[PDB]
Amino acid sequence: GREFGNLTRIRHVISYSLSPLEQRALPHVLSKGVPNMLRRVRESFFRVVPQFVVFYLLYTWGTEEFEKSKRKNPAAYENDK
């Protein structure tokens, strides 16, 4: 079936490659890779983060409320006698 002899039909594309032993494995990290990671974080920040911030607010609120609910109310004894 699917085999490297007849996958698709292409015309007029040229490629060039070096061998691994001719070139470096980690050529430019701090001059190219770091800024690229930075933009890659920039492009997705506001699509992911705010939902989790909202989750954090909800969690803390619900915890606080549950913990208030367990403390004794002075009006339950002071009001009528």
């Binding site: 490297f4 002899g5 007849n6 996958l7 698709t8 292409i10 490659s17 061998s19 691994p20 032993l21 001719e22």
Partner: protein, 68 residues
């Protein structure tokens, strides 16, 4: 004559070529083939419908045997 005087500095007679040929033997072939072919990086060129031409790593790994 012309090519020889440019490349070698001198005409090499057929007798000398015969003497050089007579010295080769299977041991010499083994040695020299190993000296230029075995575990080396090749240069490759392809033109045409060449989807099935193996990847360069696959070609490089074909230049040596694991059982040797």
């Amino acid at each position: 004559i012309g090519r020889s005087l440019l490349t070698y500095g001198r005409r090499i007679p057929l007798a000398e070529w015969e003497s050089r040929i007579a010295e080769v033997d299977a041991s010499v072939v083994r040695e020299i083939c190993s000296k230029y072919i075995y575990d080396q990086c090749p240069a490759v060129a392809g033109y045409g419908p060449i989807e099935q031409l193996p990847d360069y790593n696959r070609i490089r790994s074909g230049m040596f045997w694991l059982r040797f």
